[PDB]
Design a binder for this molecule. Structure first.
Ligand SMILES: [Mg+2]
Ligand SMILES: [Mg+2]
Ligand SMILES: [Mg+2]
Ligand SMILES: [Mg+2]
Lengths: 222, 210, 210, 222
């Protein structure tokens, strides 16, 4: 019955491992969906309950289920930074290169939110390092923008295009300079960033560093 | 006003995140900040009640950063239960998806009404205060007292106060010294989670000679 | 022994550096650590006295790291004056060249002799201790008291004690609770510089019911 | 008389700006030397007294004076991290590329001791970035060994040979891996470090990371 599925969706979201097992022991649909088409595996991965995630997977959960926004359980585990849940989803066959309606992959969200270990394991399971979202942003764009130094090095070492341009013609050097991340600018420059590249406005990372008022980045970019 | 201070403290803790908190356990405000441009939809579900919408408010802040926020009505602000949140763009693309508990994000106002008084014996000071105004569960609010001294001394004492006690006795004070006292508040565990309030307005005393 | 603990704390502060300190103001020990191989000469000059040599001692430590150190004799350990140091290799090549003041690098032993006693009124505890043993200038030693509580409470109070006072009165304590007390020592300013001693051996009390 | 020079050496070492001026007003040799051939400018730079350094320089101090160990005042200001004293010495004509009996230049000592701003200004005044000391060590060897991330980036960006070998055939990658500096290993690898290079013992940075017991560096070097 659908009620057992609704109770299962509530039990998984509430982190009640015993109630989850009781409901499925009574025939609850493990792939039950709410009005957002989110399965209990979505909610278990969102709240970081590794136990329920493993129980749902052991009972046949659709590991690649997608909700109406295009997000999958691995998207949620990667954004929230749940390392162990990311691993078990991946080895169950979760698609590391699935993208939501933003065009963002779990590597985008992990690189944006600064989850270094998850960035590594996603790449280790074959994540496209140069994936572009709907805005042309790549994981390096997001990591350089949000000041995640180690992730920038990890992405670059695994073949990230340092001179990648998004829908506005901005490189990671543009975003890093716009947010004042000095050492990331140094790393990008070292990795071969085109310092003379200008966005759709015609501004380089230097022109941004002057408009920002940062003398240090202005002296570096020249 | 006082809300801007708390929002700034949380934004530095989690940039690019959807931050929720409660000041007095009778409401809930979730907010985030992003770059420049109803293009967003805030929907929430609370303990087997139908998915409702929340009116998002938009205001600029800092260097062209736009802050969107939703204050859930007082009817849907019950604590100790899961509350699921979804921010979705107009295109149906995702933006945020979280599951929070209302009681786990309490950011109290600072305690008020400080009164510091010298004891009848030299070196001791009796400090009293009031809970954060218009806040329930005052029996569950724990405090911390800070004692600072002039001339570069900085903070010389930090004393944690029990739940529901709004009184503090301080000793070991140097004579002929201007001491300054402040207290902050926090919701005790395990029933409530959160961080310390801002420090109260201070009161000062010049200790006698001994 | 007790010396190894202090040397380890300083080495983490300044790797590859020539670290000097004094435990009791009656001696001075300078040391550094480097990789594996009398190949070094330690010479010093003190306040218009002729340049003398100091016998360097060599011992291994950690993962193949060799530690060289010199303990200046008690005759050349006067404080409040510049003392110039030079470590030179056998080839005459430089290694270290510093100018220190003996009183500015004091690392005291921990205070000893703690005695915690419940007061005649519930909630108060009188704590007493002794200065670091065999240390002069006990009038110039300031202390800090730490009050910890069980069951994950951690440190609940930190009270700084005046110069030369070896007594502390603590209040605002929860009843029926095991509290643990420790104290550390430091040389007060402006005459002496340095860091806190290690925490003393602790003493514990179970407060009564109130 | 020599006594005024001895009193001046004591006054400069003691940071007594008034006694320094009184002694030179009475004809004290500003370039007086102790038994180590250290001038008052040496001691003023060692203790970080910018005022006395400027007074001595204004009265004709030998800005490039060397003691019997080969160290100059700029060596001392660079090791101790005295930024303002390094600047005034340099603009008075201090030789940025002078070396002591260790073959070390002020860039060696600043890079070893982690003084990032001094590393920059020394390079800005023409310091040889690839200078080798008596052990074949370069500033990048010392910075990578002691875990100074920003200095590694600064040296590399200013033309430091990433694959430089010292008297033992060790590269900066060897020293960084030997001391467990992960991000510096990532930077060196990104800058083109030869991961297969082996020292005079025949060990690569990987072989060092295994002998050290560091699994993380071992997984990076492969
Ligand atoms: Mg269905
Ligand atoms: Mg705090
Ligand atoms: Mg401390
Ligand atoms: Mg001469």
């Amino acid at each position: 019955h659908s009620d057992l599925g609704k109770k299962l969706l509530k039990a998984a979201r509430a982190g009640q491992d015993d109630e989850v097992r009781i409901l499925m022991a009574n025939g609850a649909d493990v792939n039950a969906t709410d009005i957002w088409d989110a399965t209990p595996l979505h909610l278990a991965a969102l709240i970081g309950h590794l136990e329920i995630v493993e129980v749902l997977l052991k009972n046949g959960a659709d590991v690649n289920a997608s909700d109406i926004t295009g997000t999958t359980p691995l998207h949620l585990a990667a954004t929230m930074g749940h390392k162990e849940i990311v691993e078990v989803l991946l080895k169950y066959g979760a698609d590391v290169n699935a993208y939501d309606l933003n065009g963002a992959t779990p590597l985008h969200l992990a690189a944006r939110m600064g989850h270094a270990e998850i960035v590594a394991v996603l790449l280790e399971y074959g994540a496209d390092v140069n994936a572009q979202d709907a805005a042309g942003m790549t994981p390096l764009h997001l990591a350089a923008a949000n000041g995640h130094d180690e992730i920038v090095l990890i992405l670059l070492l695994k073949g990230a295009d340092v001179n990648a341009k998004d829908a506005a013609g901005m490189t990671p050097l543009h975003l890093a300079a716009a947010n004042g991340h000095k050492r990331i600018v140094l790393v990008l420059i070292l990795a071969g960033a085109d310092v003379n590249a200008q966005d759709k406005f015609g501004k380089t990372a230097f022109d941004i560093s002057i408009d920002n008022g940062n003398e240090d980045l202005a002296k570096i970019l020249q | 006003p006082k809300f801007e201070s708390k929002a700034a403290l949380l934004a530095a803790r989690g940039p690019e995140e959807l931050l929720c908190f409660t000041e007095r356990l009778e409401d809930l405000v979730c907010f985030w900040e992003e770059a420049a441009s109803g293009q967003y939809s805030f929907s929430y579900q609370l303990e087997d009640e139908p998915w409702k919408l929340c009116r998002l408010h938009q205001a600029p802040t800092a260097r062209g950063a736009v802050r969107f926020w939703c204050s859930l009505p007082t009817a849907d602000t019950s604590s100790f239960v899961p509350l699921e949140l979804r921010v979705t763009a107009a295109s149906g693309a995702p933006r945020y998806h979280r599951v929070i508990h209302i009681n786990e994000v309490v950011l109290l106002d600072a305690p008020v009404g400080l009164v510091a008084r010298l004891a009848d014996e030299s070196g001791h000071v009796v400090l009293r205060w009031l809970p954060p105004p218009e806040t329930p569960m005052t029996s569950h609010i724990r405090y911390e007292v800070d004692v600072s001294a002039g001339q570069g001394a900085g903070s010389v004492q930090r004393v944690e106060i029990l739940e529901g006690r709004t009184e503090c006795v301080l000793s070991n004070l140097r004579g002929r010294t201007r001491y300054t006292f402040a207290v902050r508040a926090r919701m005790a565990e395990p029933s409530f989670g959160g961080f310390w309030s801002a420090w109260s307005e201070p009161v000062s005393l010049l200790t006698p000679s001994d």
